[PDB]
RNA sequence: GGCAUAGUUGC
DNA sequence: TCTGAATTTACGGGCGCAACTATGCCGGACG
DNA sequence: CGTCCGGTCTTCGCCCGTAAATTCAGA
């Protein structure tokens, strides 16, 4: 956003809803805002090998089929990691509480 | 370690409530251990005032009286 | 063209790619699997025929007699599907099979037997699968979920570094059979190969080899190359193949024919190999050190002593060389053991083990299998024969044999079920080669190694398991029976087969209670691919490998639709287009591309086959003829997306939506949503509740109609015709003349299922959607079930949504609802609840259902009738009495004048003890049905007689109207036939309609047809009479209730829960929320026109969880409702049809290159008015999954209406009347009501019933229990200074009987003080430790 | 005998029915299902309930909205006691029947008893001590608990269908413990770190960020204002936009003295929104903490400084007021999101 | 009113 | 031919909390 | 319907710790 009606132009911090809602720190961060407009970055196969051709389209433009397939690799791995890491976290906190 | 530190406690009740109940109970029975129930889990199991917060005065009275 | 069902509401489509393969029958897997389980198979490969031919014929241990198989038949189901659901018995058909028994007499290997005897024996009941793919087992609709287990065959694993922690990647070969004992070949850190059976104790591999009757020299020859050492003159001249000299360092100076090819010390190079190859060197002198390390191939004997000199598989030395020099052994055989290409694994295996003879191996393996028993040769031999060489105890499937041969690069794909020596030899050779380095192990999670067990295969397996037991019984009895005395009835016992099949269909990890609250829920539960169940994984064992999505899941298994929780990835859902191969592997369609022309033929490719090809993505732009416009098209050759040339393409994805589930394909703008939120959206789309009225989602995907019609919720028209009589509970179709079968006339009747209970307390209601005199076509929809609209699946409603924070009432994800949504009752949902009271034949006399109850006046008895049962239609409320039963099983007999003292007091306390069937507290509704079941000889009460008479009259009625419809059609057809060849019309009415058997017609086949229809009339009348009598007998007869129950009374409530703060609601893009306030309509934000919004969501829920698909859906729905509003305005003031059709065509033609192209010139200006009438509430939009509407087209559709192009309007506040700056997003998102209602979650407890073992409160809400103060909650209190609160929590309020009693009484007295006491749970622990030899006691203070 | 004791040590667990190992005494006093981790360290408790939670942003930080039906079910003994104390029912049976029938007089009794009787709200996975906190009940018509928005960060509890349990302390010691240790007012700072754990989360922070910001030019830019009060008067009347650079006269009290607040009047150059917010801040804080954009971290630092300088009651009142104003002005802002807000970088064509 | 299984919800 | 050490192998224990719905079950084989 | 005694087929995870058996490295 650049606003001026009293003479020369002057830049200012934008009012854009996504940027306001991210800079304010309410919800979202650099990663998510980047994924909305910019290319959504590098995603890795479950082996850990990073795919040569990453998703070159954001969420505003549509993700073609294979880009979505890579994205679901990532998301499924994340959900499984959550579901099978909560167990280790619970065990660790139980052990710590029963020590001290 | 935390596991071994909690398993090897002066009072068998805490370790028994922790993992390895069979081994801890076997150790206590063989050695004829005795419990002073001076912890938190132990009083919780017994079901009396905790020696942590508002019950600390009550346990101070306990230590005074005997 | 359109089939007159889509001509009522032409759903606008934005797709670009033209559909090639239409969506197949979505329930194809279940239907086909069971169809190949009950249909007779002449070849004997499928179904019960396979099992019977596998087990039968059966002989005795001696050639006495044999029982053999003829053919099997499925009888008429005793009870119909609706009757089975109502009564509660399994929907099954008796299994009747013909068996012929023959007896072999003395010297009768082929001679004629003494007699032949046959009967149609009965073996149990086989549950049947209804037209919807579901089973009915005990009155509940259960569906068998297909299983995805490891295919039988041979698999090679790595276990890279987790074992031995030294970087030694092992290699173990597993031979998984379809049924039998596993055989695992394994390596060790010492490079010695070991075999383990059934994953029992490990043992050296050569034990099995020797048990196969192989001598050590034979094994060495089989598994190694031979090097010939010749004692020609001296120095032990050697035979050398130059090809084997590459990869090592020459330990000597190589020379032959006077040429020093390589000097001493320098390794063997490539050029040295070339020199040796070109000079054709075959014999070379060698030093005496070269033999020092080699191994003798085969055992050798001496001519002096006549005994052994060097055992097979032992390292030769100078001593052995000297000993054999005088033995005359000029020619010597040695095995070639290269260090890094051909390791000496088998030699070390032979050296390590102690066993040497076959019997030694047999006894060792017998000891391993059977520890403790004194071994014997006979038992060991029988055991090893039965382990891997018996057709009964071990059986590689046909698919197993195919995979086993394929993994070993064999040629034939058929063979014997049992293993063979060659098979084990080849498996071990392949394992050795993999260990060397040539070849690669096979990944476990490849979709080419996981079959799809459907219900048919599992049912066949369980049936075979039952046949094993019945065959054992028959064989045991077949030796000890008087043959010529009985038919083959006592021969076969039906108990085992029936028990096994009932156990499988009733209680199994794959026989699941059906998630029945949406058509989508049913259709996605039937297409479920579960990795759990027998023969498969367990959710707490596998992980991090089977959970994740593999590159081969493309096109076969949905990646994004999988439940989140303990089992994520193990409960995958089948893709839309995926089929099942003959062997059971998942295959998906592809479009053949021979040359640059994209042919229109579809090839299905299994996972393994897809690998050796290259397939183009669906989104490949084409021209009219079909040619990839871009010279380099993206494809996927070997699990790797890459940009290949226009030429190399061999296949193209059939459609852009073949990678998703049938449930995840309904999420519009799916490509714009992050995978996590798409998964959540599908999961909660499965859980919507059918509202009172469906509302045709404005922004769909075009897959709604397929899902709705395929799932058995709508009443699709079996034959096209013209509707004749359609009321709220019946549809009658007059079959067209063309489609009418020759003979029976024969006009279809559809009985709609009115309000009935579902498996999740939801109402399954079918209502007609066609008017009288409206034609219909085959496959057309006549009635739409729950959450359906005109054949389109509409789970929830859509309403005007506005994304903006509103006073914090939508803080985290909460949703603010306008009171208009409640007023219109568009989220009101009908829940049908079933309550049953039983009269058990308990001691102290039976129980009675009389209306006379004590301790309650006539006020509580007002709703009950004279028979102690509530009226149908009573507006019952919580705490009332439904079926007042009082038990003669009451209380004690007179004790010390108990009754005398009661009479003295003034009150009559009798054996009449009040039980009651009271509605659960806080539940209101209406009684819609009462059904009473009574065993024979119990004298059903007056209400039972009345309901029985009503049901009998209703059955006689329904049959009478069925006959009347059939005869109306029959007489109409006869009249139509009469119009040619002497038509009588003036006097035809004079004679009665029935008296058409005296008609005067000429000599042609038309009078033959009239006589055929007379025969049809006779058949209809007689069968009507017989069926009426049979139905009356069925109604009047008793019921096979549970043992000891007199009568059961089931009362069906119908509660209506509209909406309230707490009811969870979510869109389709994984945006959840619980209603926070039923805001007044005047307080809501409203636009300039003055239309208040309905829902106010939270904008902050968009960025963090990147489900931008909901924003685009909001814009598209806003545009669709703009078009609908334009149509509604053009229709509110009457306008010429010309302008209306012009506008509708302009709307339907809007797009970039849409492939719908509906022409309105062929609607006759009459259907157009109906189209406008149905479109006035917003034009439906179809948006395929990954070929959806781009944002530019959304802008165009906005601009067609008067709406703003940016998608954001200016909203004025409802309360303060002032404008909101920063104009907001407003539109019509399609939102659902999830089946998580607050009143189903709210729960509280002061004090109620307690448990028994530990005197603690009960757990749960179905029983009036209390919350669990878990361990971390106690830690939370301990971290606090909360001591007294904790003691009160886990001492007084939980299980201190004296403590809780005194606390209750003190609180009643108004004093808040407690007696701590001691918990009784600790007393339980003390007693349980004392039960052992552990003496635990509390010492004196 | 071995099977009767720890079963499964030798051979196989002998099974009795349907091929599942039988529980033995050792298996009955060991493990997750034993009497230790199932009925000793954690026990089912009466006077408890459960339901879905809801926002209810009108509540103060020290109270929670309890459904009326749950309130009636939980406090049944207390209602009996009050009914007998007032003599409206001689026998417990009569009081029980009166409570069941839900007369018009029982509700007044429930209101009388709920006055100063804190209840504990405890979400399912109580990871840390803040997972359980006490609030004073407020009778709410409905079936869902209305929980104060600020403590959601403490519970890690969004409003997408989360359920929380209620617990009713009975004894005087338990009530005093809840009031003096477990009220949300006393739990401002997390035990792990000194940072506050009631920082405004999602809508309050957006509202404050929108309020305290400056654009180059807005309605009534540059005018001089005599104080925050007329700044609010201007904004409500619509004369000057919420974000307009102006000059305001500020009275900021600093306590540099020996525990005395020393006034100071100056002319600060800020925006209308900043002044309107400054009308909420207590006396003892400097104005410089409201002259910035007030992101989430800035608001958290504001609250932390308020706690450090003033005390506890000022910080609790400040949290309530900051939540209220943030919600109000976020609503007034109408900060929405649209597909045209995710602007593509038109110059990414050359980059790609 | 206790066990087993299946499914589901929040983390 | 013995004998202590370090290593390897075998085998015992752990794998979070809270809540809701449904079904099936005490066992199938002799008087 | 009423009483009354009990055993073929199944493995199939990962990590850690501690105790038992095997093997060095000598004397
Ligand atoms: C007819 C077909 C061959 C066609 C060429 C072969 C190939 C694989 C065979 C099925 C699988 O083996 C699994 C299963 C094994 C059971 O034991 C018997 C039933 C099952 C369903 C088999 C029936 C049939 O035999 C199949 C379909
Ligand atoms: C329209 C149609 C004419 C076809 C030539 C006639 C022929 C037979 C008629 C039905 C039957 O009578 C059974 C039943 C009797 C009830 O009382 C009223 C409803 C029913 C369904 C009737 C409606 C209608 O009248 C029918 C379909
Ligand atoms: Mg939540």
Short mmCIF file of C-alpha atoms (C1' of nucleotides) in Angstrom, two decimals, chain C residues 140-143 512-519 521-522 525 528 686-690 756-764 829-834 1055 1057 1234-1237 1240, chain E residues 6-8, chain F residues 20-23:
data_model
loop_
_atom_site.label_atom_id
_atom_site.label_comp_id
_atom_site.label_asym_id
_atom_site.label_seq_id
_atom_site.Cartn_x
_atom_site.Cartn_y
_atom_site.Cartn_z
CA UNK C 140 -27.75 -54.37 12.69
CA UNK C 141 -26.32 -53.37 9.31
CA UNK C 142 -22.65 -54.43 9.35
CA UNK C 143 -20.16 -54.16 6.49
CA UNK C 512 -17.47 -53.34 11.58
CA UNK C 513 -20.60 -51.64 12.81
CA UNK C 514 -21.64 -49.45 9.89
CA UNK C 515 -21.05 -45.71 10.18
CA UNK C 516 -24.54 -44.88 8.89
CA UNK C 517 -25.42 -41.20 9.21
CA UNK C 518 -24.72 -40.04 5.63
CA UNK C 519 -24.86 -41.67 2.20
CA UNK C 521 -20.49 -42.36 5.38
CA UNK C 522 -21.93 -45.64 4.08
CA UNK C 525 -17.13 -47.28 4.86
CA UNK C 528 -12.50 -49.08 3.17
CA UNK C 686 -18.10 -38.25 6.70
CA UNK C 687 -19.87 -37.21 9.94
CA UNK C 688 -22.56 -34.74 8.86
CA UNK C 689 -26.10 -35.23 10.15
CA UNK C 690 -29.02 -35.20 7.67
CA UNK C 756 -36.47 -45.66 10.75
CA UNK C 757 -33.58 -45.86 13.18
CA UNK C 758 -30.02 -45.77 11.85
CA UNK C 759 -26.86 -47.15 13.42
CA UNK C 760 -26.09 -43.66 14.80
CA UNK C 761 -29.60 -42.79 16.05
CA UNK C 762 -30.33 -40.88 12.82
CA UNK C 763 -33.51 -41.08 10.75
CA UNK C 764 -33.34 -42.67 7.30
CA UNK C 829 -32.05 -32.80 12.82
CA UNK C 830 -34.31 -35.73 13.71
CA UNK C 831 -32.73 -38.36 15.95
CA UNK C 832 -34.53 -41.68 16.42
CA UNK C 833 -33.72 -43.41 19.71
CA UNK C 834 -34.64 -47.01 20.53
CA UNK C 1055 -36.39 -36.33 19.37
CA UNK C 1057 -32.64 -31.13 18.52
CA UNK C 1234 -21.36 -32.70 12.70
CA UNK C 1235 -22.84 -35.46 14.83
CA UNK C 1236 -21.32 -34.08 18.06
CA UNK C 1237 -24.22 -32.40 19.84
CA UNK C 1240 -24.90 -35.75 23.82
"C1'" A E 6 -14.49 -51.78 16.29
"C1'" G E 7 -15.22 -46.80 15.25
"C1'" U E 8 -14.99 -41.67 16.78
"C1'" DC F 20 -18.27 -40.91 23.49
"C1'" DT F 21 -21.22 -44.69 20.36
"C1'" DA F 22 -21.98 -49.65 18.99
"C1'" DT F 23 -21.52 -55.00 19.55
#
